[PDB]
Amino acid sequence: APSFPFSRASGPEPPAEFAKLRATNPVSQVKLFDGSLAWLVTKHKDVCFVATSEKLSKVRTRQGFPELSASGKQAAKAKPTFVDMDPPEHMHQRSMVEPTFTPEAVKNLQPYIQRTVDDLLEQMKQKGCANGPVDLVKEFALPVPSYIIYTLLGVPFNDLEYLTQQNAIRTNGSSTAREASAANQELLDYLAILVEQRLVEPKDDIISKLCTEQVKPGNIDKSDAVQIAFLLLVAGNATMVNMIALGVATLAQHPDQLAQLKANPSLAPQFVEELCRYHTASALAIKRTAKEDVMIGDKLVRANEGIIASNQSANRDEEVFENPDEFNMNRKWPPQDPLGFGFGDHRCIAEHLAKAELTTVFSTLYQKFPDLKVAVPLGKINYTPLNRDVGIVDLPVIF
Ligand code: HEM
């Protein structure tokens, strides 16, 4: 059994193992860091099954849960939020914050999302690049998702920049263990204060609604409110940043498609659809342990055995997506859902928001800067560690 997680074939490529497994051993065993074994599911149909099977659990206190790192095993001890819950607890808590993420709520948020993007792009323009390149990530990819989620949660305008930098240090590869934890503690400390303030005088934000609707009635306590807010902040920010960056690098890799996007920004939605399928920036979140024996493919997964379902592999499943390794914004989509945001009950709570953010970004970026170009040869782009989810650390650009 090979060691998992696998390492990406190259910077923008997914691990080479998946394609081989999908064709020869779709449901196999991989060895984890602590030596334990887990079942790796690689086919779209099977990934979907794992994501919805009632015989599988996301509770991390069950022996056999596939923790991929030493830290992940330690994080499993704390009190769980809905991300690690099974029904009925899962929706009991998730529904407490879902209202802000519904399709209708996100549609009504479009003007705000646009404004946030426009203001950051103009700040980037004024900042100019007459003396050299600017880092698209630091100046645009990082603050877009950050400001939006922080603002939705209830953080005031003046605190955004500092909090955005701190949350980044959390996941920054350059950060030492101590720096990442201190930054993490800071965000939690800040959130604790916000909850206290919002309990006194609620405002129009997520934290306020949790305080008024759940904390006050006694459904959850203050710490719970802080943890749910923390989850919403750290669950998808780093991923949003990587998606925007990979989107720009991808358009630079396929000039004709960039020309097409510029010529018709109305194509942004489909470009985003293909981007989320082609670049699965969160490929290690669909994990479970079997509550009881369950049959998947030609394998029997026994009770208490862990399972990892690669939505990244499923998104390159040739049986579902024709020419899967070809990035095509004009792709003819099949009836099967691409799985960039997971599947089933736990499907990304912010999928509509994330897509709206990306669609706004790619229907605006090149209209603001029609001549935007990566200021380094594309083959020298600084990507995330090959053994980690796909993403880009920094992207020098000129415009
Ligand atoms: C484009 C960026 C994003 C991608 C690609 C993404 C992807 C995912 C994936 C693959 C999962 C696993 C779903 C499953 O278990 O089947 C997930 C879960 C989740 N995401 Fe996102 N996400 C993104 C942005 C966001 C944002 C912006 C937020 C916060 C506002 C967020 C909050 C969450 C939460 C809370 C969960 C857990 C849902 C649950 O377990 O019920 N995500 N996301």
Length of the chain: 399
Å from CA of 110 to ligand 1 middle:
19
DSSP β-bridge partners for residue 263: none
Q: DSSP 3-state assignment of 39?
A: strand
Q: Is 48 annotated as a binding residue?
A: no
Active-site residue, from 313, 348, 360, 384: 348
Residue in the block written with tokens 């400001």: 147
In ligand 1, the atom with minimum distance to the C-alpha of 94 is: 41
Active-site residue, from 46, 84, 224, 389: 389
Give nearest CA residue, ligand 1 atom 31: 236
In ligand 1, the atom with minimum distance to the C-alpha of 358 is: 1
- Eight-state DSSP code of residue 318: T
Q: Is 228 in the pocket of ligand 1 (CB under 6 A)?
A: no
Q: Is 141 in the pocket of ligand 1 (CB under 6 A)?
A: no
- Eight-state DSSP code of residue 3: B
In ligand 1, the atom with minimum distance to the C-alpha of 232 is: 29
In whole angstroms, give the CA distance from residue 290 to residue 50. 10
Alpha-carbon distances of 175 from 62, 135, 245, rounded to whole Å: 32, 18, 20
Sign of the dihedral through C-alpha 159, 164, 170, 174: negative
DSSP β-bridge partners for residue 397: 134, 374
Q: Is residue 85 a contact partner of residue 224, using CB atoms and an 8 Å limit?
A: no
Angle at 362 between CA 262 and CA 231, to 5 degrees: 175
Please give the domain boundaries of the chain with CATH numbers for all domains. Answer: 1-399 (1.10.630.10)
Residue numbers after which the chain breaks, C to N beyond 2.5 angstroms: none
Mutate to test the pocket of ligand 1, among 348, 352, 359 (most ligand atoms within 8 A of CB): 348
Q: Is 232 in the pocket of ligand 1 (CB under 6 A)?
A: yes
Q: Is residue 17 a contact partner of residue 6, using CB atoms and an 8 Å limit?
A: yes
Active-site residue, from 28, 42, 171, 282: 282
Q: Cβ contacts of residue 109 below 8 Å, gap of 6+?
A: 353, 356
Q: Is residue 215 a contact partner of residue 199, using CB atoms and an 8 Å limit?
A: yes
Residue type, 92: H
- Is 146 known to be catalytic? no
Q: Cβ contacts of residue 230 below 8 Å, gap of 6+?
A: 187, 188, 191
In ligand 1, the atom with minimum distance to the C-alpha of 152 is: 30
- Is 164 known to be catalytic? no
Angle between helices 143-153 and 237-253 (to 10 degrees): 150
Strands 134-135 and 37-41, sheet pairing: unpaired
In whole angstroms, give the CA distance from residue 395 to residue 390. 14
Nearest to 291 by CA among 66, 80, 58: 58
Bond before 5 cis per omega within 30 degrees? yes
Angle between helices 268-278 and 351-362 (to 10 degrees): 120
**Whole-number CA gyration radius for the chain:** 21
Annotate 263-317 with DSSP letters as a single string.
Answer: H-GGGHHHHHHHHHHHS-S--S--EEEESS-EEETTEEE-TT-EEEE-HHHHTT-
Distance of CA 391 to the CA centre of its chain: 10
Sign of the dihedral through C-alpha 83, 349, 48, 4: negative
- Is 100 known to be catalytic? no
Bond before 66 cis per omega within 30 degrees? no
In ligand 1, the atom with minimum distance to the C-alpha of 276 is: 5
At residue 394, φ and ψ (nearest 5 deg) are -150, 150
Nearest to 194 by CA among 167, 225, 218: 225
- Is 337 known to be catalytic? no
Residue type, 43: K
Q: Is 27 in the pocket of ligand 1 (CB under 6 A)?
A: no
Q: Is residue 173 a contact partner of residue 386, using CB atoms and an 8 Å limit?
A: no
Sign of the dihedral through C-alpha 59, 60, 61, 62: positive
Helix residue ranges per DSSP H, the chain: 17-24, 44-52, 70-75, 89-94, 103-108, 110-127, 136, 143-153, 160-171, 177-200, 206-210, 222-234, 237-253, 255-263, 268-278, 311-314, 351-362, 365-368
Distance of CA 110 to the CA centre of its chain: 20
CA atoms within 13 A on the CB side of 124: 26
Å from CA of 58 to ligand 1 middle:
15
Helices and strands counted in the chain (H then E): 18, 12
Q: Is residue 46 a contact partner of residue 296, using CB atoms and an 8 Å limit?
A: yes
In whole angstroms, give the CA distance from residue 49 to residue 182. 39
Resolution of this PDB entry, in A? 1.7
In whole angstroms, give the CA distance from residue 3 to residue 29. 10
Q: Cβ contacts of residue 358 below 8 Å, gap of 6+?
A: 240, 243, 244, 247, 272, 275, 276
Å from CA of 33 to ligand 1 middle:
24
Strands 56-57 and 373-374, sheet pairing: unpaired
Å from CA of 152 to ligand 1 middle:
16
Distance of CA 315 to the CA centre of its chain: 15
Distance of CA 351 to the CA centre of its chain: 9
In whole angstroms, give the CA distance from residue 155 to residue 224. 18
Q: Is 281 in the pocket of ligand 1 (CB under 6 A)?
A: yes
Å from CA of 305 to ligand 1 middle:
24
Q: Cβ contacts of residue 236 below 8 Å, gap of 6+?
A: 145, 149, 282, 348, 350, 354
Å from CA of 342 to ligand 1 middle:
8
Q: Is residue 261 a contact partner of residue 275, using CB atoms and an 8 Å limit?
A: no
Angle at 134 between CA 128 and CA 140, to 5 degrees: 90
